[model samples]
Target: NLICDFFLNTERQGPGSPEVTLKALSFIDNLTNKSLIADLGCGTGGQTMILAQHVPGKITGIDFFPGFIERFNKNAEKLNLQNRVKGIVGSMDDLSFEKDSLDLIWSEGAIYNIGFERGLKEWRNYLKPGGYLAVSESVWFTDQRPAEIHDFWMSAYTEIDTVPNKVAQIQKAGYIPVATFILPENCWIEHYFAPQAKAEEIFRRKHAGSRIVEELITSNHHEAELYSKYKAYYGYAFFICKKGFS
Candidate 1:
């Protein structure tokens, strides 16, 4: 019924689709090998498995929710990644890891839950000197986001920022901006919109008990209409930062 159910319910649909797989690969391509990495708010080892494959070293995933940690570990064992990947239940506001212990940290659409400035300030301590942090977050496409979009995200997310705003916040965290990606059109079009629409149609015919089914039914229609109306203003963004002065 919660958000985690929608994401971690492998039985609902494709556990981890090729689109997410490719997105993880893209994140991996940008990282250096044999690094100690952490996936913040990683859900059920989706991206954690990808990071383990990429780094080939220690990969730790942290989330406050215990259910997610349980499933994440289960999946890691099933994939024979039990030794390489470990998921923990904890908070990013106060991570349990030691200072300067990690080589890199990756968070996809998670930092905003803790607020950019607060997350940058709090999580900055976990990175070793020169370690990189890759974050994929939702950002306003323009300086002034539309009131409709703003209102929707403001309630949906605890923190929503712009690309420039994140750049500034990352800089203020004493991290140099290494790179950033404006999520490709297909990122949204293929994953959220198209599949969501398909799921909505299927749910309409088959099942409606699962929360995700209902969400797909509601969200797909809303997004389809919103994107059609404000095609230019809808987008997602990514940022790669290093723990050093700019």
Candidate 2:
């Protein structure tokens, strides 16, 4: 798939950094060695590796793309984390975990594939009482916005909402909001878009005549540019929540 191919070997598939990943984990209460965790849509396992090192737990990283899963496994092996971390090719929409099995679930810039509210509602079924869930989602930064970028996102994600609205949805879905943060611009440009721009240049030369590749590269650059111009209007929102016991 062009999408997977376009993102191959990048530092990360989306806007995030290990610092923020750790920061999100900081809000979660009492993670221990026996805790069971999973990173849904763990592209190449960048944050997955971080979790393996910082948290004492068996972490399973899942992605729909086999290319990503293979890279994730290799990196886990290189980091000597094969014992603690493992990557598997799987779908988030059709998770196969037993009910009440997971202690923590984390998704970075990938939960949108299954809508924010729906992901929270559905995945909560797999978490034990008081388990944590952390996800980074695209959200409007302010109510006022220029129509250009606003329309773009409205078309891209109709369910997009403000931070407080997302928190309200979290409560509606039966999770207690622990904390929330807007990702810094550096997380988008430095960690994600910059590397992707370089990769696009290489791909442009290698697959010069392929319309699909060219269009994909162009779209990637366009998105980065849009972020730069309209960052004040919208950005990634990391939401940390805990499931409650009945």
TM-score of each: 0.79, 0.97
In model 1, the Cα lDDT at residue 167 comes to 91
Candidate 1 local lDDT, 1-246, one digit each (tens) = 455444454322212233544454464333454667888888666766765764556888898778889898998898898887888998887787888778778777678768777877777788877777877777777776678877877677746666888799889889987777677666566555665554445445555576666766676578667766765775667777788841
Top-lDDT candidate index: 2
lDDT tens digits by residue: candidate 2, 4-61: 7767759799999989999998898758899999899999888888878888989989
What count of clashes does model 2 give? 0
Q: What is the lDDT of residue 222 in candidate 1?
A: 86
State the TM-score for model 1. Answer: 0.79
